[PDB]
């Protein structure tokens, strides 16, 4: 049972870490895209 718990816990923890990394990368990509769109909207507001 301890081996089972440790395998399952290692699986869950490593997959949560992988999730952390993927969410982090998606957050940086989203931040770059949002900054681009924010500058575009400022340009739109001034042109408007």
């Amino acid at each position: 049972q301890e081996r089972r718990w440790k395998v399952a816990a290692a699986k869950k923890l490593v997959r949560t870490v992988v999730r952390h990394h993927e969410e982090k990368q998606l957050r940086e990509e989203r931040g770059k895209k949002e900054e681009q769109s924010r500058l575009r909207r400022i340009a739109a507001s001034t042109a408007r």
């Binding site: 400022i42 340009a43 001034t46 042109a47």
Partner: protein
Amino acid sequence: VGALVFDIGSYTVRAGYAGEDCPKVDFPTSPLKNGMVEDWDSFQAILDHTYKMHVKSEASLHPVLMSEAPWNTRAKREKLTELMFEHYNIPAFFLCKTAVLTAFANGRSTGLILDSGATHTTAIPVHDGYVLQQGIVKSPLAGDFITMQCRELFQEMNIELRSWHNYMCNCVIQDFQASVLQVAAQMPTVHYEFPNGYNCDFGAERLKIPEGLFDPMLGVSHVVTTSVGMCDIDIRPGLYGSVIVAGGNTLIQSFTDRLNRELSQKTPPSMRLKLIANNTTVERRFSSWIGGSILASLGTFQQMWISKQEYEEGGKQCVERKCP
């Protein structure tokens, strides 16, 4: 406290107040060879000359707007804000692209801008006031190239065409352009006289010299046609129906007419291509400064500028954040 608007253009600097129509001072610009600030000491010195001599006012009182080239790098903008705020202690700042100011001056936010200056002629598509960096096309067939064709032809004429003498040389080759150049195949021509009285029958050269920017490198028509090719697929009809030109270096006779012919025969015949004829020298030279002036005048510029408070709170990062 009337807002001050400056253009730091490559070949002549235009300065004035936001609410005033014309740049009250327009003098030759150098620290801007490639298009942005090459020499920070020289650029700072010329700016100081501007506020003190040209406009006879301190920078600590009026709010200030500056305009930078479309293709200028970001470090240039960051250092520009650092220098301006630290040294001149203005109350509020802003930065704008010259092409965007040209499109604003024409009251047409969505546009394509053809402009040229020292060493460069560029085509920029602007959609809803945002310059598409990926779509810009930059060519070396600037007014400098044509004026150097003029200078070479004059030296071949063997006319006697310290720095002030070179400035005079450049001016005369420019002055000759406005009067003579038009875009045996040209028939008899003008008698344009030099200040000392020298002259000649400036014949086919007036036709062959302007031909360089179309056919000496990418000519202007190709520059624009590929510029729109690199832009978005479906906004392209908007650009053609909104093509605009600006800059004193564009002031040649029938130049805009030849552009219209070139684009009409190059564009699909079905397209709504049209050129906005701000062809007068005054119009082209004031176009960018005009856009800056309008931008500064409005009641929203009070919220768009980079207030001194902003730069106190944060450093150079504000330029990328507050200026498109």
